[PDB]
C-alpha cells in the first residue's frame, strides 16, 4: 500500500508554483500522509518552495525555528525512492 513517511509533518507550499506542480506536491504529500497547511502558522514544519529565500522566512523563523525550507525536488525524490529523505539535501538557504 501507501508508505506513510510524512506521518505527522505539516507542509506549506510557499512559492508561485507551475499549477500542476502544486497538485503533484499536494498529491505526493497527502499521499504519504503528509499534513498540508493553507497558511504559515506554528503547525508548519516544512515550507516547500520552488522560489527563492524570502525575508518572510526570517520573521517566520524568528517565531518558529523548527522550520525547514525545502524545495519540491525533495518531495519528489522522496517518493521516487519510497523513503523519507533528509530535506537537508534539498534545502533553501538565503544565499549570503
Amino acid at each position: 500500500e501507501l508508505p506513510d513517511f510524512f506521518q505527522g509533518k505539516h507542509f506549506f507550499l510557499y512559492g508561485e508554483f507551475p499549477g500542476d506542480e502544486r497538485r503533484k506536491l499536494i498529491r505526493y504529500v497527502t499521499a504519504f500522509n503528509g499534513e498540508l497547511e493553507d497558511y504559515m502558522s506554528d503547525r508548519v514544519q516544512f515550507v516547500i518552495t520552488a522560489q527563492e529565500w524570502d525575508p518572510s522566512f526570517e520573521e517566520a523563523l524568528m517565531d518558529n525555528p523548527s522550520l525547514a525550507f525545502v524545495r519540491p525536488r525533495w518531495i519528489y525524490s522522496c517518493n521516487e525512492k519510497q523513503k523519507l529523505l533528509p530535506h537537508q539535501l534539498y534545502g533553501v538557504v538565503p544565499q549570503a
Side-chain angles (χ1 to χ4, degrees), residues 5-6 8-10 12 19-21 26 29 33 39 43 49 61 63 87 95-96:
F5 33 80
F6 291 17
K9 316 180 188 304
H10 305 32
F12 189 72
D20 47 73
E21 249 223 313
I26 302 175
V29 172
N33 206 18
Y39 56 107
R43 312 182 203 121
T49 202
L61 213 9
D63 205 308
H87 49 313
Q95 199 182 356

Side-chain angles (χ1 to χ4, degrees), residues 4 6 10 14 22 25 28 45-48 54 56 60 65 69 73 76-79 84 88 93:
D4 37 41
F6 291 17
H10 305 32
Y14 188 69
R22 170 165 304 242
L25 290 187
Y28 283 104
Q45 292 155 238
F46 302 78
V47 168
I48 309 311
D54 192 298
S56 300
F69 294 87
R73 190 60 151 179
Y76 298 157
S77 33
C78 241
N79 149 246
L84 211 177
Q88 296 112 19
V93 294

Side-chain angles (χ1 to χ4, degrees), residues 13-86:
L13 308 218
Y14 188 69
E16 243 204 350
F17 292 90
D20 47 73
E21 249 223 313
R22 170 165 304 242
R23 246 251 240 189
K24 285 241 274 178
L25 290 187
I26 302 175
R27 180 173 169 206
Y28 283 104
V29 172
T30 78
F32 297 125
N33 206 18
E35 217 64 67
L36 236 128
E37 300 294 322
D38 310 297
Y39 56 107
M40 197 83 238
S41 62
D42 327 280
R43 312 182 203 121
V44 197
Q45 292 155 238
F46 302 78
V47 168
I48 309 311
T49 202
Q51 270 193 207
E52 282 316 278
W53 188 277
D54 192 298
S56 300
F57 297 175
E58 307 177 18
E59 61 232 38
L61 213 9
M62 71 103 229
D63 205 308
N64 170 215
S66 57
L67 277 189
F69 294 87
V70 212
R71 39 196 24 141
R73 190 60 151 179
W74 178 37
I75 279 145
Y76 298 157
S77 33
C78 241
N79 149 246
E80 228 247 83
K81 261 63 149 54
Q82 296 289 114
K83 191 41 216 166
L84 211 177
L85 290 198

